[PDB]
């Protein structure tokens with residue numbers, strides 16, 4: 001058991017081991033605040049997320065457990081993986097705080113597209129890495145569901161990692177990347193929900209502006225349908241939701257726009273990919289494993305450096321437990337964590 005030390009960082013008190021030094025706050029995370037640190041043991045610069053009161057409710061505690069179990073499982077270059085987890089608590093009885101430790105990056109794609117000119121190659125590298133993380137993420141029967149720039153951490157030398165996987169109204173940017181099916185509650189939609197979100201990002205990288213900047217769920221669906229066209233009889237009987245199916249029919253039927261006329265001055269191979277990613281019916285979207293083979297990524301595609309993952313155990317998700325039973329489950333995982341080589 002290492003020595004801990006206390007530091008007041010933005011009205012909240014952090015208690016960390018000696019090995020983490022030079023703590024500077026960075027902003028928001030998923031259900032907590034994040035600090036940057038230098039890990040004197042491994043020599044890496046690391047982001048440390050402290051979870052804010054993780055055991056105050058049942059919905060909180062399960063989510064505390066959910067987040068830690070995801071990261072433990074993730075060992076991939078383009079996916080955020082757990083480097084360490086600790087707690088200042090000495091025993092289960094006093095145990096209340098969880099600090100997660102992962103790799104550190106410069107910013108997400110929100111803070112860069114502003115003051116950058118991005119050559120066709122920048123896109124090639126950036127999208128290839130997303131889909132590479134996705135292929136791996138999806139192989140463990142996991143969906144992100146909320147893929148967007150803000151959760152794609154990025155480097156000076158253009159390296160990329162994915163955050164907030166496995167975890168909303170008006171003129172807000174958190175909705176502009178959603179696949180229409182999950183946005184409007186349609187069906188057992190599948191993994192290819194994230195392939196839509198790519199298509200929307202890639203476009204924004206290629207054009208410098210948002211593809212579907214809707215003012216509400218409806219205004220956005222209309223923007224989407226203007227480009228990709230209105231559903232045929234095939235996709236209608238696939239929507240297993242009464243109210244949604246009823247609304248789609250009532251809409252004036254629109255044909256598919258010519259994709260070359262929208263994203264202009266862009267690589268023809270990039271265009272042909274977007275057509276295969278922005279398909280409305282998610283039984284006909286190109287899969288991650290398939291997307292890497294596309295001739296667009298010809299100079300990066302290395303099949304022997306595109307690994308899949310081991311199946312993820314999600315049987316804990318269908319269990320009704322109390323606070324202290326999620327707490328105990330979590331406690332066990334934290335003290336049983338063994339750091340990488």
Ligand SMILES: Cc1ccc(C(=O)NC2CC2)cc1-c1cc2cnn(-c3ccc(F)cc3F)c2n(C)c1=O
Pocket residue numbers: 026028029030034047048049067068070071080100101102103104105106107108152153154162163164165166167
């Ligand atoms: C510390 C941490 C813990 C967990 C998760 C996570 O996604 N968990 C769910 C289960 C999958 C993410 C992070 C996490 C990692 C990194 C790396 N870099 N940056 C980062 C730093 C400055 C900046 F401007 C942008 C940035 F992305 C991170 N931020 C802001 C983070 O929140």
